[PDB]
Design an enzyme around this catalytic site. Structure first.
Site, PDB file in Angstrom:
ATOM      1  N   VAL A 293       5.787   0.591   1.225  1.00 51.87           N
ATOM      2  CA  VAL A 293       5.716  -0.659   1.999  1.00 51.87           C
ATOM      3  C   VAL A 293       5.726  -1.904   1.106  1.00 51.87           C
ATOM      4  CG1 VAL A 293       4.592  -1.847   3.981  1.00 51.87           C
ATOM      5  CG2 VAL A 293       4.430   0.634   3.788  1.00 51.87           C
TER       6      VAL A 293
ATOM      7  N   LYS B 112       9.418  -1.249   5.112  1.00 49.62           N
ATOM      8  CA  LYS B 112       9.215   0.081   4.559  1.00 49.62           C
ATOM      9  C   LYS B 112      10.518   0.732   4.180  1.00 49.62           C
ATOM     10  CE  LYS B 112       7.207   4.023   6.554  1.00 49.62           C
ATOM     11  NZ  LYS B 112       6.031   4.577   7.284  1.00 49.62           N
TER      12      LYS B 112
ATOM     13  N   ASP C  53       1.098   4.862  11.360  1.00 48.13           N
ATOM     14  CA  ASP C  53       1.458   6.212  10.868  1.00 48.13           C
ATOM     15  C   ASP C  53       1.263   7.377  11.864  1.00 48.13           C
ATOM     16  OD1 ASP C  53       2.472   5.407   8.320  1.00 48.13           O
ATOM     17  OD2 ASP C  53       0.452   5.495   7.409  1.00 48.13           O
TER      18      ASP C  53
ATOM     19  N   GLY D 173       0.741  -1.261   0.000  1.00 41.70           N
ATOM     20  CA  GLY D 173       0.000   0.000   0.000  1.00 41.70           C
ATOM     21  C   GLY D 173       0.768   1.307   0.000  1.00 41.70           C
TER      22      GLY D 173
HETATM   23  C1  LIG Z   1       6.714  -1.141   8.029  1.00 39.43           C
HETATM   24  C2  LIG Z   1       6.146   0.067   8.736  1.00 39.43           C
HETATM   25  C3  LIG Z   1       6.963   1.156   9.052  1.00 39.43           C
HETATM   26  C4  LIG Z   1       6.486   2.245   9.761  1.00 39.43           C
HETATM   27  C5  LIG Z   1       5.163   2.277  10.198  1.00 39.43           C
HETATM   28  C6  LIG Z   1       4.574   3.383  11.017  1.00 39.43           C
HETATM   29  O1  LIG Z   1       3.425   3.299  11.448  1.00 39.43           O
HETATM   30  N1  LIG Z   1       5.373   4.432  11.281  1.00 39.43           N
HETATM   31  C7  LIG Z   1       4.923   5.628  11.993  1.00 39.43           C
HETATM   32  C8  LIG Z   1       5.867   6.286  12.909  1.00 39.43           C
HETATM   33  C9  LIG Z   1       4.711   5.545  13.446  1.00 39.43           C
HETATM   34  C10 LIG Z   1       4.325   1.206   9.897  1.00 39.43           C
HETATM   35  C11 LIG Z   1       4.794   0.123   9.153  1.00 39.43           C
HETATM   36  N2  LIG Z   1       3.873  -0.867   8.723  1.00 39.43           N
HETATM   37  C12 LIG Z   1       2.906  -0.702   7.785  1.00 39.43           C
HETATM   38  O2  LIG Z   1       2.717   0.358   7.182  1.00 39.43           O
HETATM   39  C13 LIG Z   1       2.020  -1.868   7.559  1.00 39.43           C
HETATM   40  C14 LIG Z   1       1.910  -3.110   8.113  1.00 39.43           C
HETATM   41  N3  LIG Z   1       0.929  -3.921   7.606  1.00 39.43           N
HETATM   42  C15 LIG Z   1       0.252  -3.300   6.635  1.00 39.43           C
HETATM   43  C16 LIG Z   1      -0.835  -3.940   5.882  1.00 39.43           C
HETATM   44  C17 LIG Z   1      -0.537  -4.945   4.958  1.00 39.43           C
HETATM   45  C18 LIG Z   1      -1.536  -5.502   4.169  1.00 39.43           C
HETATM   46  C19 LIG Z   1      -2.841  -5.068   4.290  1.00 39.43           C
HETATM   47  C20 LIG Z   1      -3.165  -4.081   5.206  1.00 39.43           C
HETATM   48  C21 LIG Z   1      -2.164  -3.535   6.003  1.00 39.43           C
HETATM   49 CL1  LIG Z   1      -2.623  -2.369   7.200  1.00 39.43          CL
HETATM   50  S1  LIG Z   1       0.811  -1.676   6.327  1.00 39.43           S
END
Ligand SMILES: Cc1ccc(C(=O)NC2CC2)cc1NC(=O)c1cnc(-c2ccccc2Cl)s1
EC number: 2.7.11.24
Length: 337
Positions: free
Chosen positions: A34, A49, A164, A27
């Site tokens: 990602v 990511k 996020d 996504g």
């Molecule tokens: C790998 C990664 C790196 C950073 C952050 C994050 O939230 N950073 C912000 C500072 C706080 C989140 C993820 N991790 C993701 O972004 C995901 C994990 N799983 C996901 C997913 C996969 C398939 C279908 C639906 C989803 Cl929700 S997206």
């Protein structure tokens, strides 16, 4: 130091170690792209990511250090946590790529409402977990600011994780004060988002599905009426106050008439949530204590965050200075067991 291998995913250069396998894009993921991968080591499905241009701008280099610092501090069940952080760089001089690894989430709440109404106990479990997650984030003096079903992750067991956070057809969950430039905002801007999300779970439809900034606002208010007497005085902005008076005077609507058949306590919480007065809006901790979560609320199992040093936020440093602080955070990282 593990062995790194290069690959091209949708014209992107991905250089990852000899443990993360079968990389497939999923996504978005704020300030990056990602990938879904299979970690050899643990034998799990992970989310990788690659930060987009991490040290190419002042805003990016600062945001890169911000994101990495947040992920290393988050220790909660309802909050996304950091499993690993790597770079194809050997020295500080060649550090221009940052990779963040987390668990791969099954789905997001955009699909968990998609075409069907949810049971009241399902909404209870989801919203309780969002609130529990928000409670922890707010105790560290962090606010999401862009909370939406897109960054609310769920698995098979409906075990929720907030994504996020603390970095900020899209702005449908935006609070009225951080949109119409009202009184100097608080953490309850996320409670507004929780409110819009809760309504969407019960009804199966978006509460305020606006098309622009003017529409979005008329819609929020076609339900909370116009600010009345005590509130009209509180408005700081000289510009936006001209629009509130320009609007036809709307009355406050009954939430029982819009959320028909829904749990009376769920109506009460939504009414304590979707308050136009940011001063009177219920907090994450207060919303957990609400009677609607009688089956799930446990003050002994709702932890607060360890102290989070955010002094770097007031610091105005150069790209290469932020690049240096990030590199130390990559090498000082202790992986969780
Ligand atoms: C790998 C990664 C790196 C950073 C952050 C994050 O939230 N950073 C912000 C500072 C706080 C989140 C993820 N991790 C993701 O972004 C995901 C994990 N799983 C996901 C997913 C996969 C398939 C279908 C639906 C989803 Cl929700 S997206």
């Amino acid at each position: 130091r593990p062995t790194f291998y290069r690959q091209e995913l949708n014209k992107t250069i991905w250089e990852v170690p000899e443990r993360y396998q079968n990389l497939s894009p999923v996504g978005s993921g704020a300030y990056g792209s990602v990938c879904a991968a299979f970690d050899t080591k643990t034998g799990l499905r992970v989310a990788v990511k690659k930060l987009s241009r991490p040290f190419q701008s002042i805003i990016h280099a600062k945001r890169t250090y911000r994101e990495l610092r947040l992920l290393k501090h988050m220790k909660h069940e309802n909050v996304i946590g950091l499993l690993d952080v790597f770079t194809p760089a050997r020295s500080l001089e060649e550090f221009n790529d940052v990779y963040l690894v987390t668990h791969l989430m099954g789905a997001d709440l955009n699909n968990i409402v998609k075409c069907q109404k949810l049971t009241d106990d399902h909404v209870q479990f989801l919203i309780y977990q969002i609130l529990r997650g928000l409670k922890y984030i707010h105790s560290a003096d962090i606010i999401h600011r862009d909370l939406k079903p897109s960054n609310l992750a769920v698995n098979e067991d409906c075990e929720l994780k907030i994504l996020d956070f603390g970095l900020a057809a899209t702005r449908w969950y935006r609070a009225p004060e951080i949109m119409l430039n009202w009184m100097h905002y608080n953490q309850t801007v996320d409670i507004w988002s929780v409110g819009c999300i809760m309504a969407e779970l019960l009804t199966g439809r978006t509460l305020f599905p606006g098309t622009d900034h003017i529409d979005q606002l008329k819609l929020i208010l076609r339900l909370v009426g116009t600010p009345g007497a005590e509130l009209l005085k509180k408005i700081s902005s000289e510009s936006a106050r001209n629009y509130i008076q320009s609007l036809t005077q709307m009355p406050k609507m009954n939430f029982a008439n819009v959320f028909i058949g829904a749990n009376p306590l769920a109506v009460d919480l939504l009414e304590k949530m979707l308050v136009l007065d940011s001063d009177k809006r219920i907090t994450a901790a207060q919303a957990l204590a609400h009677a609607y979560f009688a089956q799930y609320h446990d003050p002994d199992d709702e932890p607060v965050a360890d102290p989070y040093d955010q002094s770097f936020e007031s610091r105005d440093l150069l790209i290469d200075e932020w690049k240096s602080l990030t590199y130390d955070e990559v090498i000082s990282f202790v992986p969780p067991p």
